[PDB]
Scaffold this active site. Sequence first.
Site, PDB file in Angstrom:
ATOM      1  N   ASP A  69      -5.862 -10.118   5.473  1.00  0.00           N
ATOM      2  CA  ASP A  69      -7.097 -10.898   5.351  1.00  0.00           C
ATOM      3  C   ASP A  69      -8.299 -10.225   6.037  1.00  0.00           C
ATOM      4  O   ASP A  69      -9.357 -10.076   5.425  1.00  0.00           O
ATOM      5  CB  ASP A  69      -6.914 -12.316   5.915  1.00  0.00           C
ATOM      6  CG  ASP A  69      -5.872 -13.141   5.157  1.00  0.00           C
ATOM      7  OD1 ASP A  69      -5.584 -12.839   3.976  1.00  0.00           O
ATOM      8  OD2 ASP A  69      -5.345 -14.113   5.751  1.00  0.00           O
ATOM      9  N   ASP A 113       0.830  -1.202   0.000  1.00  0.00           N
ATOM     10  CA  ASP A 113       0.000   0.000   0.000  1.00  0.00           C
ATOM     11  C   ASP A 113       0.876   1.269   0.000  1.00  0.00           C
ATOM     12  O   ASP A 113       0.854   2.059   0.945  1.00  0.00           O
ATOM     13  CB  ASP A 113      -0.935  -0.037   1.215  1.00  0.00           C
ATOM     14  CG  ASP A 113      -2.138   0.906   1.084  1.00  0.00           C
ATOM     15  OD1 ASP A 113      -2.795   1.166   2.125  1.00  0.00           O
ATOM     16  OD2 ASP A 113      -2.432   1.382  -0.043  1.00  0.00           O
TER      17      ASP A 113
HETATM   18  N1  ATP Z   1       2.549   8.078  12.568  1.00  0.00           N
HETATM   19  C1  ATP Z   1       1.850   9.140  12.108  1.00  0.00           C
HETATM   20  N2  ATP Z   1       2.262  10.393  12.335  1.00  0.00           N
HETATM   21  C2  ATP Z   1       1.591  11.470  11.883  1.00  0.00           C
HETATM   22  N3  ATP Z   1       0.453  11.373  11.175  1.00  0.00           N
HETATM   23  C3  ATP Z   1      -0.077  10.178  10.876  1.00  0.00           C
HETATM   24  C4  ATP Z   1       0.600   8.957  11.331  1.00  0.00           C
HETATM   25  N4  ATP Z   1      -0.129   7.926  10.899  1.00  0.00           N
HETATM   26  C5  ATP Z   1      -1.190   8.423  10.220  1.00  0.00           C
HETATM   27  N5  ATP Z   1      -1.155   9.768  10.210  1.00  0.00           N
HETATM   28  C6  ATP Z   1      -2.143  10.667   9.572  1.00  0.00           C
HETATM   29  O1  ATP Z   1      -3.444  10.088   9.666  1.00  0.00           O
HETATM   30  C7  ATP Z   1      -4.037   9.976   8.369  1.00  0.00           C
HETATM   31  C8  ATP Z   1      -4.874   8.701   8.289  1.00  0.00           C
HETATM   32  O2  ATP Z   1      -4.074   7.552   8.028  1.00  0.00           O
HETATM   33  P1  ATP Z   1      -4.760   6.136   7.703  1.00  0.00           P
HETATM   34  O3  ATP Z   1      -3.681   5.102   7.549  1.00  0.00           O
HETATM   35  O4  ATP Z   1      -5.837   5.925   8.728  1.00  0.00           O
HETATM   36  O5  ATP Z   1      -5.467   6.337   6.267  1.00  0.00           O
HETATM   37  P2  ATP Z   1      -4.734   6.966   4.978  1.00  0.00           P
HETATM   38  O6  ATP Z   1      -3.430   6.246   4.764  1.00  0.00           O
HETATM   39  O7  ATP Z   1      -4.736   8.465   5.098  1.00  0.00           O
HETATM   40  O8  ATP Z   1      -5.717   6.616   3.751  1.00  0.00           O
HETATM   41  P3  ATP Z   1      -6.258   5.144   3.391  1.00  0.00           P
HETATM   42  O9  ATP Z   1      -7.219   4.786   4.475  1.00  0.00           O
HETATM   43  O10 ATP Z   1      -6.930   5.374   2.065  1.00  0.00           O
HETATM   44  O11 ATP Z   1      -5.058   4.245   3.314  1.00  0.00           O
HETATM   45  C9  ATP Z   1      -2.894  10.070   7.362  1.00  0.00           C
HETATM   46  O12 ATP Z   1      -3.295  10.728   6.171  1.00  0.00           O
HETATM   47  C10 ATP Z   1      -1.821  10.847   8.099  1.00  0.00           C
HETATM   48  O13 ATP Z   1      -1.856  12.224   7.756  1.00  0.00           O
HETATM   49  C1  MRA Z   2       5.620   1.552  11.536  1.00  0.00           C
HETATM   50  C2  MRA Z   2       4.575   1.090  11.194  1.00  0.00           C
HETATM   51  C3  MRA Z   2       3.327   0.500  10.797  1.00  0.00           C
HETATM   52  C4  MRA Z   2       3.318  -0.625   9.952  1.00  0.00           C
HETATM   53  C5  MRA Z   2       2.096  -1.207   9.569  1.00  0.00           C
HETATM   54  C6  MRA Z   2       0.849  -0.670  10.035  1.00  0.00           C
HETATM   55  N1  MRA Z   2      -0.435  -1.147   9.750  1.00  0.00           N
HETATM   56  C7  MRA Z   2      -0.862  -2.216   8.971  1.00  0.00           C
HETATM   57  C8  MRA Z   2      -1.858  -2.015   7.953  1.00  0.00           C
HETATM   58  C9  MRA Z   2      -2.451  -0.680   7.755  1.00  0.00           C
HETATM   59  O1  MRA Z   2      -2.372   0.190   8.611  1.00  0.00           O
HETATM   60  N2  MRA Z   2      -3.121  -0.442   6.604  1.00  0.00           N
HETATM   61  O2  MRA Z   2      -3.746   0.816   6.359  1.00  0.00           O
HETATM   62  C10 MRA Z   2      -4.931   1.101   7.123  1.00  0.00           C
HETATM   63  C11 MRA Z   2      -5.990   1.915   6.377  1.00  0.00           C
HETATM   64  O3  MRA Z   2      -5.818   1.866   4.977  1.00  0.00           O
HETATM   65  C12 MRA Z   2      -2.281  -3.114   7.156  1.00  0.00           C
HETATM   66  C13 MRA Z   2      -1.734  -4.395   7.356  1.00  0.00           C
HETATM   67  C14 MRA Z   2      -0.778  -4.573   8.355  1.00  0.00           C
HETATM   68  F1  MRA Z   2      -0.261  -5.788   8.552  1.00  0.00           F
HETATM   69  C15 MRA Z   2      -0.358  -3.518   9.146  1.00  0.00           C
HETATM   70  F2  MRA Z   2       0.552  -3.768  10.090  1.00  0.00           F
HETATM   71  C16 MRA Z   2       0.907   0.459  10.873  1.00  0.00           C
HETATM   72  F3  MRA Z   2      -0.251   0.982  11.319  1.00  0.00           F
HETATM   73  C17 MRA Z   2       2.125   1.055  11.263  1.00  0.00           C
END
Ligand code: ATP
Ligand code: MRA
Lengths: 289, 289
Positions: B157, B130
Amino acid sequence: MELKDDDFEKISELGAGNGGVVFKVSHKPSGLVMARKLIHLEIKPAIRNQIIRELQVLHECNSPYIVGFYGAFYSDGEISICMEHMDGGSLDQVLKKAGRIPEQILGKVSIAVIKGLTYLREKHKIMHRDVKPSNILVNSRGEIKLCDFGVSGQLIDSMAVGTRSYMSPERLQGTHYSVQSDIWSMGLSLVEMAVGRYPIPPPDAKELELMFPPMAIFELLDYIVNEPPPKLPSGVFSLEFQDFVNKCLIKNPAERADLKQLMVHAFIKRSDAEEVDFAGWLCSTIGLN
Amino acid sequence: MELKDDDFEKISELGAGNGGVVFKVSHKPSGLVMARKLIHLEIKPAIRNQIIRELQVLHECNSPYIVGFYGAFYSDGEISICMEHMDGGSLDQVLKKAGRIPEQILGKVSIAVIKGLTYLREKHKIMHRDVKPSNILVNSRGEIKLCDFGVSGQLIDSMAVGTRSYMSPERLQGTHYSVQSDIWSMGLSLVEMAVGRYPIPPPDAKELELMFPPMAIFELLDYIVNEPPPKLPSGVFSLEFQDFVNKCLIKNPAERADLKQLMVHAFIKRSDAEEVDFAGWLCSTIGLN
Ligand SMILES: Nc1ncnc2c1ncn2[C@@H]1O[C@H](COP(=O)(O)OP(=O)(O)OP(=O)(O)O)[C@@H](O)[C@H]1O
Ligand SMILES: C#Cc1ccc(Nc2c(C(=O)NOCCO)ccc(F)c2F)c(F)c1
Ligand SMILES: Nc1ncnc2c1ncn2[C@@H]1O[C@H](COP(=O)(O)OP(=O)(O)OP(=O)(O)O)[C@@H](O)[C@H]1O
Ligand SMILES: C#Cc1ccc(Nc2c(C(=O)NOCCO)ccc(F)c2F)c(F)c1
Ligand SMILES: [Mg+2]
Ligand SMILES: [Mg+2]
């Protein structure tokens, strides 16, 4: 009475998916058991007022085939839609347990869906937009009601999938779709519930006998818009049901049956007549009443 | 130290989408500011143990190009992934404000992504799965880190879209995809950030001059797998960057460049050399430092 966040109390969790979580809740001041849907939205104050104001029309949505509405409001990062608690859950939920919903019963489903769609179109000039087994709700009083229809333009915008699609060929292809798209959705929903699994791709000659691998996003959508529509397996379903779904699953919006024509189709005529214990069948298969 | 639900305290909300909500939180016993991702999942006790046990490998994921991991645990209907708080947010967030991320900077992004992907493959034998602007994180110390990669089979999954797709043609078509799919994702991400908008469908001769309608789900996926790949607009980007993305956006997995070949490509060689104030550019455009 006006609904408020601090006036509610979580009982259990009814389910979730693609934007919303719905809890079985209790409205402390009224004592009413409710289903509360929360949609998490990063939305500017001005256009979450619009959504709430647009959802007020749901107060004017009264029909035995539409889920009751109590109220809608915004509370710290979520908008809340409060509706009747349907103790039977969704048709997709009863299908898991049933394995297969009998033709007789699906006829009582069709009637409700066609009457529900009809009510929304004639009295409110809106199409449903998301007709699928999970958006059709049942209860122990044998009521079959629709929810999650498109009352709010701005809420549709604010949310705008997965690997199962009930979207019509014309809707998958462009913006040239309308109310006729709901017929396809219903059509496909009815085939799924009949045979026991999402009917694309169609089962093979061996799987047909067995009952009686996951498809990629493009392989699936390509099948819908290009390859011939799904059919009900012959012999084990009446010629009346077959013609009903076939007329529903005509790829061309304008060739496809409408609500008017479907209301007077042989299968519905036949289903209106039949004396069936839905509540009996429902509760007996899901272990409730 | 072992992470626990009652040991945290919400500060603000960093964002959400398709399964996860991420809050800026505070770990009371350590005092550390953290990003906590919550994934709501209706999962049986036995196979949410698996997910938690599978996410423990993230403790062994140490790299300047991978987001730090603190802990993962389950708490009443959600699994929690606790990671480093990136104060700059995601590249999709900085793009909104920037309008366009300069070629010079995108080269520093590419280096990080290619080094991040490389680390995960060589040392952990996993593909990302992703790669997109929102899964690439930045901070004020000028660090560019990847998150949301596929460590957990069972979590993949458990969740198995929208209207923007960064999935490779081969992945959209079937199960015959692997690590090379991440290159396409990166490739397409880099074009988006360069021009200022998702590059499918390609902009027309008028829009090209202007800068320097939404596409339906099938129209979009059909374009990706069938119509020629997106290109960087000529003249206003170096021949080095163009060849980089072109080599990334080759439809055929095996013809497409790999991590090895991309690491020694002219554009990366050129980007490694260049002296750029990323932290300066980042903070100055997003108003932080
Ligand atoms: N470790 C982090 N530090 C700062 N901001 C974060 C972090 N993780 C996520 N974010 C913020 O939160 C938002 C949401 O992330 P999330 O993984 O829930 O969905 P996404 O990657 O934006 O989109 P999608 O759900 O389509 O994958 C991100 O766009 C990012 O700006
Ligand atoms: C550092 C770091 C870090 C690595 C992986 C994930 N999360 C995930 C996701 C994930 O967050 N997918 O995106 C969520 C919404 O699109 C999917 C599968 C998986 F095995 C993970 F460990 C995470 F959080 C943080
Ligand atoms: N009023 C209600 N009464 C009883 N159960 C409900 C009610 N509303 C929703 N549910 C249950 O909660 C579940 C979640 O509904 P939700 O609208 O959040 O997503 P969905 O329709 O299941 O799927 P999708 O997100 O793909 O549309 C439903 O499957 C249903 O079983
Ligand atoms: C009775 C009743 C009832 C009617 C509509 C919605 N909800 C929606 C949804 C909706 O819930 N969509 O599904 C959510 C997850 O797929 C989308 C647009 C809109 F304008 C609504 F009012 C609802 F809750 C309950
Ligand atoms: Mg629903
Ligand atoms: Mg993410």
